[PDB]
Amino acid sequence: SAADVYVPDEWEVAREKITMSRELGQGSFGMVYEGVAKGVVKDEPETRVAIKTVNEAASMRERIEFLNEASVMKEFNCHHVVRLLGVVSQGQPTLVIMELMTRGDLKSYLRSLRPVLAPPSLSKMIQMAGEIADGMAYLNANKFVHRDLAARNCMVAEDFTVKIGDFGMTRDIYETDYYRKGGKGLLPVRWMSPESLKDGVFTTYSDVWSFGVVLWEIATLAEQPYQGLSNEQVLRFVMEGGLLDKPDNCPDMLFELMRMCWQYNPKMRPSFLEIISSIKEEMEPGFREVSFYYSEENK
């Protein structure tokens, strides 16, 4: 296996080029912040950024697995995936400078719409659907599965664009979205595919499955899936072929999309590129300019 060390490369940023403006809420490894960082964007003066830290009471090991996780993202460069701008390995605390997403996670954003004004339009939904499908399609292309795709792990950018959220950001308040299946590890059973539940495997296919539960979230303004059913009852229901009900006033198209995402046989569900294909005529023109879908890279 790989060692528990971190070799500083060209992502290393001089701490003196950073400033903390305020807290945003504790995260997996510690307090996350909002601030500014010089020399992070090319030809750009300053940049508003998110700064993830690691508690002082953390093991060098946890601290090492923090930079390792952030490094996986050193490879990504997709408009619909919250980007890593830099790293600060030298000193204390250990930082990770990310792209700032002023509007937070999609689940919070969505539920905040519950409380003249009308709910999200199909056009706006297709937008989020396509934008999310784009990030996942990009990641899967790079041979990467999410294992935890959900509204809570999607970010809403300043201009409302949705991107695949980076690691260690899930809000502590959604703790309920997890369950210790078989008294073992914490799993997001309400977003998991029938096969992942039964065989413990996660593939590109189980991501499309989750994608579908997310399309559901977007439409039900983020209702807990299988609300009536308890965690243990969900495992039976889903594994036996039970689906989620078409939410009220849910456009035919979206539930139609959902239905396909939930084909019991994983190979029968569409891949992320196909999902985009069936909804590309609904996507805004800019998507043509920033998406991985129309990008060179798609081969």
Curated annotation (Swiss-Prot):
Catalytic residues at 148 (proton acceptor)
* Gene from which this protein is expressed: IGF1R
Record-listed cross-link Glycyl lysine isopeptide (Lys-Gly) (interchain with G-Cter in ubiquitin), residues = 181, 184
Q: Which organism is it from?
A: Homo sapiens
Whole-protein residues included: 982 to 1286 of 1367
Q: What is the lineage of its organism?
A: Eukaryota, Metazoa, Chordata, Craniata, Vertebrata
Mutation: residue 294 to F; reported impact is: No effect on GRB10-binding
Positions contributing to ATP binding:
24-32, 52
Residues recorded with modification Phosphotyrosine: 174, 178-179
According to UniProt, the name of this protein is Insulin-like growth factor 1 receptor beta chain
Top-level lineage group: Eukaryota
Q: Which residues carry this modification: Phosphoserine?
A: 291, 295
Substituting residue 269 to S results in: In IGF1RES; significant decrease in IGF1-induced DNA synthesis and AKT1 phosphorylation in patient fibroblasts
Write out the topological domains of type Cytoplasmic. Answer: 1-299
- What are the residue boundaries of the Protein kinase domain, all occurrences included? 18-287
